[PDB]
Design a protein around this ligand. Structure first.
Ligand SMILES: *[C@@H]1O[C@H](CO)[C@@H](O[C@@H]2O[C@H](CO)[C@@H](O)[C@H](O)[C@H]2NC(C)=O)[C@H](O)[C@H]1NC(C)=O
Ligand SMILES: *[C@@H]1O[C@H](CO)[C@@H](O[C@@H]2O[C@H](CO)[C@@H](O)[C@H](O)[C@H]2NC(C)=O)[C@H](O)[C@H]1NC(C)=O
Ligand code: NAG
Ligand code: NAG
Ligand code: AKG
Ligand code: AKG
Ligand code: FE2
Ligand code: FE2
Ligand code: FE2
Ligand code: FE2
Ligand code: MN
Ligand code: MN
Lengths: 691, 691
């Protein structure tokens, strides 16, 4: 029964990087004691350990485990570790891996291992101070000379190995080197801790070692082991702060519009609503497209008053996206006042107005909120890569996007929205060629630039932050290209083009009215939706005239005509039909219990009533089960005329409403007539549903 | 200027027949004076005129016109007649015709007439008494010797003709013999008198003579000339009577059913409603068909109590129609109490209950009321014949059937309904072989039997009397063959099978009700219509069961079924569709202004609700614009259950009505449900119109 207090973990680390702190946090979890050597190739490792071991030269009572710091996390307790080391019958136990290195010619000299790791790895070992001192004291070589060779040549001595009883950890009982065993390692879960199991040897290693190229694989494991994320306690390091009286850090806001993006006017307006003192935020905005110049210009006088200072970079600059992200990020670096940098792409839709706070309270170096393309799996981060630096899907990927497991995660790639510490920009990565420099995509060059400096790229799915717009095929050849975004961005299209109280009226609560017997009146369209549909209609500018036939029933003749434009003529039928299924259909089935509509409508047109031409519509029936009648402009302001009238009930809709729609049975019992418009112009949208 | 008072018309007539009285009525019209000789072949004519002329032997001041009586009517005034006779420069003027008779060998001796009638006719002449006496006194021959030869041989004497200045009326200036000139004669009209014009010679004859076979042609003319019927004064001989306190003449009513006839039960019932003292009427009824035995037997206990005496002759007698019309008519002849005989066929529908009075006040020998197959020209009389005794159309035929000209008319043929004087049966036609005797059709043999005795067959269109049923193709292979009579007899089918107050409700006056919002309730079917449709339904006895699909809409499935029988199954769809167009269609267009229905209905079925099987009908919509729902039995007497319910309006038709029908919109807004029937059986007729 060896005392866990006679054990010492030693490691070498020249600075307190993210990995060294990750290692110390796991060593503090199991109550280890770690001696950090040199907080001030590779052969300088042995030289430091050599001097440190002279203190403990004659300490037969002491066990000493030396491990790497950056590429290492711990997964077991010192008690269990000593149990396995004593169980090994070895005075000094080295780690074992799959590859002979450096000299591969020495592979023949190594003893024969039946079905296990056969070669040595000097990244981690454990032994008695006396036995370890006897070895490290043979060092007399230069700092640049390889240490892996020093131990390799000493272990490979059959007599020297026999004398000091030196063995390798062939079956990864204590040391698990990841390089060469990536398929041998899986996660073992518990209530409040996580481990790794070696499915090859059915062992639970204590030390996890991401040697060689398996760095991002260790970052993945390091999100759980030992108490990264637990099935019961959740994440154990996240916040789950700012001084009350004092102000928050000064932020540099950078907005990027590198392609034509939907609902852009809505995004700049959204920038005035972030719950952060605007006197503390400088705005930088790069617009790459002349398509968006009108939108920036509309909102720019407001941003200039809101924020502390603003600066625009326009399309006349001929700035490539990478050069602008250099300039934006480098503008913050050269200002010591810039305490935080925040890059936010136009396709990012932030529905959480405290996003900037949440990410700054998180006290990380570089961090990003999780945004997901609504109803899909595509998000602004990657869980894994390929050997080609192309997207792959990691084991816990779908788990995170669906928020089954939440926390702050070490991931290989982040995009669109992130917050970067000001000091980290100027201290650990002072270069300007962060995005530009090589043919690799700027956003990929970005994450690569931070990985190559050993900086964790964190991702927080601790809360709901926002979503990502689909800009993949945004047709800009319309007067209002957003009016066709009903399929690509259903959520955003609904917020901007559907009446706010539509939802509330649909879920009961008595908003819907019934002015005539079986005529129902509810809010449907928004005032922006009506203004843009009217404008797009008149922009086509080819209204029906004489010799125009319609699907109306008066007497026995369908001769009843109208100054209209059908959706087919402007190529908007597909979109309007989806509005019927998504929005009108549910309403009709609510108002007429027992009826089921698939929203079949072949006749969809927009009507125009002017005192010069067809100011009224004579009484007719409809070639439809039910008919939808949406008014598109204000009565008394855009026109001074009557509305609709149902003769069989002697009931008149005196004043229509700008966004409200009428719903009546068409084929019978509701003989309707359109009252004359006397001044101005009256617009309505008509749909003969269920013919 | 010859005095019209020195003129004498002489004629020979052995009895006051219908023709002699017709002749005297025209002679009294123009204020002629006529001496009737012998009120007590043909040579006895001259013998009588010879003796009469000896009185006036030396009367040079006197003009004497001799004419036939039976085949003659007058058309001019004695003043105008004498004008033309004086204008002739002839002492004795004979009539002229187209045929030489008797001896045709004498045709060569007759003088040559350029373009006119060349031969003599002793049926009418005018001359001086002295000149006429000199001729008639040469008679010494027998009564049987032909008189036409006596004058022919005397006129043909060139010297004798020269001496006495004898001429013929070649151009029909005075005498118009009809035989041979039928196309030369047309009617000339005036305000209060009618004449004839000879289009061959452009003359207006005074005397009209129906010699030879042109007897019915004279009967036709004799209906107008001189004051038979005038465009202003109308008929001048009709009634246009019975003692108040005293009783009317005893009548013998004979009803004939020689073929299966529609609406027979309705006709026997109608016999109890004739406005004639039933204590004065004996009923004879011959039923030739066993098909009608149930109908006679149903009504017979009522007839026996109503009428004075009744007698039936049934199909077990094997009586041919002619033999029964002999027996019936001959039964009255052998009873002197029978003052009038009245034969009435089953196809005759008398809508005027005073028909027997009207025809007896008319004081004719044999007379008939004008009945017409509704909406057609076929009626129970003929205006003319063919040389074959087959139907032809006379000049005034359509005029009479359409009642442009009205009166009592001398026609060649009457059928179905007529009234015959009792004395005429026993006196002028005592024979029994009136209908039977020869292969000619009994009704044709009948009129022929009265024509050959010189009896006028009168016809009265002075009022509206009735109509004639179409028995031509009466399918008797049904439980109630009359239910299929909607096309053949529309008027009668409506009286018996359409609710009495349907018409009144359709012409406003607020009978129709509206128990739920757009559900209208009106009377449609009669209680006899419902009882017979129900009975015919259950008589088919093959109701829908399991695996039965219907055209109802509940949720998204048309699985809603019913214990029904469609009209197609019993072969009644054609008939029910006509009811929809004729009766339902007009009502729907009245209740829903602006709607136009051609009564399109593909689904027409009768429903049955029993407590053992499908007592209710779950909520469904309809595959129809509007739906017709007629209840067919009494609630509370034939069943004790609920009716219809409209869920969207929370309105319930608690109690349906036996003949009333419901009308609601089907496709929407009226989710309906059939309430459970708890006792008995509930029947409804459903029609999904306008799908
Ligand atoms: C949606 O409903 C809300 C609340 O019912 C409406 O808010 C009101 O707006 C009117 C002006 O339109 C004000 O006079 C009231 O004081 C508001 N009431 C509340 C409780 O805020 C809102 O206007 C409706 N939406 C639209 C487009 O009219
Ligand atoms: C058709 O309408 C008449 C008059 O509105 C109905 O006649 C009445 O009949 C009820 C019994 O059903 C009597 O109580 C009333 O006294 C009658 N009124 C008159 C003015 O005669 C007649 O019943 C209706 N037809 C049917 C089949 O009900
Ligand atoms: C570490 O030591 C403290 C006592 O100082 C003890 O309370 C805690 O439970 C220990 N943690 C572990 C994981 O052993
Ligand atoms: C016949 O004579 C009477 C006088 O007796 C006269 O009133 C009547 O008008 C005459 N009728 C005709 C048709 O001449
Ligand atoms: O509101 C109106 O103008 C009448 C609506 C109508 O019934 C039609 O479109 O024909
Ligand atoms: O009156 C009834 O029984 C219900 C009528 C109806 O809606 C149906 O036939 O389905
Ligand atoms: Fe149109
Ligand atoms: Fe309409
Ligand atoms: Fe059916
Ligand atoms: Fe129905
Ligand atoms: Mn390492
Ligand atoms: Mn004659």
């Amino acid at each position: 029964p060896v005392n866990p207090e006679k054990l010492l973990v030693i490691t070498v680390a020249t600075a307190e990087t993210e990995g060294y702190l990750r290692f110390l946090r796991s060593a503090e979890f199991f109550n280890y004691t770690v001696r950090t050597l040199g907080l001030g190739g590779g052969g300088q490792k042995v030289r430091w350990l050599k001097k440190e071991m002279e203190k403990y030269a004659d300490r037969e009572d002491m066990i000493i485990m030396f491990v790497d710091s950056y590429d290492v996390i711990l997964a077991g307790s010192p008690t269990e570790l000593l149990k396995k080391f004593v169980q090994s019958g070895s005075r000094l136990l080295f780690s074992a891996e799959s590859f002979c290195w450096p000299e591969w010619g020495l592979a023949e000299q190594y003893p024969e291992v039946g079905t296990g790791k056969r070669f040595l790895n000097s990244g981690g070992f454990i032994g008695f101070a006396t036995t370890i001192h006897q070895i490290v004291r043979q060092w007399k070589y230069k700092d640049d000379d390889d240490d892996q060779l020093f131990y390799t040549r000493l272990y490979l001595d059959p007599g020297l190995r026999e004398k000091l009883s030196l063995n390798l950890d062939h079956k990864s009982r204590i040391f698990q080197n990841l390089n060469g065993a990536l398929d041998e390692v899986v996660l073992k879960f518990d209530r409040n801790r996580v481990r790794i199991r070696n499915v090859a040897y059915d062992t639970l290693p204590i030390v996890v070692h991401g040697n060689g190229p398996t760095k991002l694989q260790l970052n993945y494991l390091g999100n759980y082991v030992p108490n990264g994320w637990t099935p019961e306690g959740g994440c154990g390091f996240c916040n789950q702060t700012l001084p009350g009286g004092q102000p928050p850090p000064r932020v540099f806001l950078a907005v990027f519009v590198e392609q034509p993006t939907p609902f852009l006017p809505r995004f700049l307006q959204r920038l005035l609503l972030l719950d952060y003192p605007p006197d503390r935020v400088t705005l930088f905005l790069h617009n790459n497209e002349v398509f968006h110049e009108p939108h920036i210009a509309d909102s720019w006088p407001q941003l200039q008053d809101h924020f502390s200072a603003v600066k625009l970079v326009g399309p006349e600059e001929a700035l490539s996206p990478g050069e602008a992200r250099d300039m934006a990020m480098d503008l913050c670096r050269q200002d010591p006042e810039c305490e935080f940098y925040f890059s936010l792409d136009a396709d990012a839709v932030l529905t959480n107005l405290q996003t900037l706070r949440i990410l700054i309270e998180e006290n990380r170096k570089v961090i990003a909120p999780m945004l997901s393309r609504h109803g899909k799996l595509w998000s602004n981060f990657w869980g894994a890569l390929s050997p080609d630096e192309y997207y792959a899907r990691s084991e816990d990927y779908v788990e995170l996007v669906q928020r089954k497991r939440v926390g702050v995660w070490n991931v290989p790639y982040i995009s669109q929205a992130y917050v970067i510490r000001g000091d980290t920009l100027r201290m650990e990565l002072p270069q300007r060629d962060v995005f530009s420099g090589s043919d690799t995509d700027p956003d990929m060059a970005f994450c690569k630039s931070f990985r190559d400096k050993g900086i964790f790229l964190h991702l927080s799915n601790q809360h709901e932050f926002g979503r990502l717009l689909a800009t993949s095929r945004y047709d800009t050849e319309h007067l209002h290209p957003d009016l066709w975004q009903i399929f690509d961005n259903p959520v955003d299209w609904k917020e901007q083009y559907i009446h706010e109280n539509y939802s509330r009226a649909l879920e009961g609560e008595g908003i819907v009215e019934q002015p005539c017997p079986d005529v129902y009146w509810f809010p449907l369209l928004s005032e922006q939706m009506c203004d843009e549909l009217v404008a797009e209609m008149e922009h086509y500018g080819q209204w029906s005239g004489g010799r125009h036939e319609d699907s109306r029933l008066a007497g026995g003749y369908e001769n009843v005509p109208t100054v209209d434009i059908h959706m087919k003529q402007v190529g908007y039928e597909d979109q309007w039909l989806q509005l019927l299924r998504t929005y009108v259909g549910p309403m009709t089935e609510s108002l007429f219990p027992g009826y089921h509509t698939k929203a079949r409508a072949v006749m969809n047109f927009v009507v125009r009533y002017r005192p010069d031409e067809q100011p009224s519509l004579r009484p007719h029936h409809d070639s439809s089960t039910f008919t939808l009648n949406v008014a598109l402009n204000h009565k008394g302001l855009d026109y001074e005329g009557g509305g609709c009238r149902f003769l069989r009930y002697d009931c008149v809709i005196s004043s229509p409403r700008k966004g409200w729609a009428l719903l009546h049975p068409g084929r019978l019992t509701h003989y309707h007539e359109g009252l004359p418009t006397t001044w101005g112009t009256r617009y309505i949208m008509v749909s003969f549903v269920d013919p």
